[PDB]
Amino acid sequence: SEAVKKWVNKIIEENIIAVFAKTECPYCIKAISILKGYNLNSHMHVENIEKNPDMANIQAYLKELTGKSSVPRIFINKDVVGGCDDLVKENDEGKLKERLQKLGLVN
User: Fold this and answer.
1) Which amino acids does the record list as binding Mn(2+) 3 (predicted)?
2) Rounded CA separation 6/99 (Å)
3) Which of 5, 22, 33, 53 shows the smallest number of beta carbons within 10 Å?
4) Rounded CA gap, 79 and 57, in Å?
């Protein structure tokens, strides 16, 4: 409960780019690949919450934070990006690059 929330928080707060994912999910894989395409590997953490005894608790907390329980769930500098579709929209429309520029992750 408190333990789960603290664990999720630590992932989000200690990594500039935090992705919560599940096993063999093409939208998780696509989102992570897009982010690595910006050379973000050094500041990215991917957590597979399907391989976790508390998956449902984690998903419920992600829904409390973001409005959705599904993965992938993507945070950038603690800001909610959302899922892969949200990432695609931001990427295509220049918003992702702008985010990353403000973080010094992209020129």
Assistant:
1) 45, 47
2) 25
3) 53
4) 21
> Measured between alpha carbons, how far is 49 from 40 in angstroms, rounded to an integer?
21
Resolution (A): 1.7
Binding-site residues for Fe(3+), in ranges, read 45, 47
Residue numbers belonging to the annotated binding site: 24, 39, 45, 47, 50
Sequence ranges of the binding site for Mn(2+): 24, 39, 45, 47
Q: DSSP letter at 19?
A: E
Identify the experimental approach.
X-ray
With tokens 């989102």, the residue in question is: 31
For CA atoms 47, 14, 43, 107, give the dihedral sign: positive
**Residues annotated within a binding site for Zn(2+):** 24, 45, 47, 50
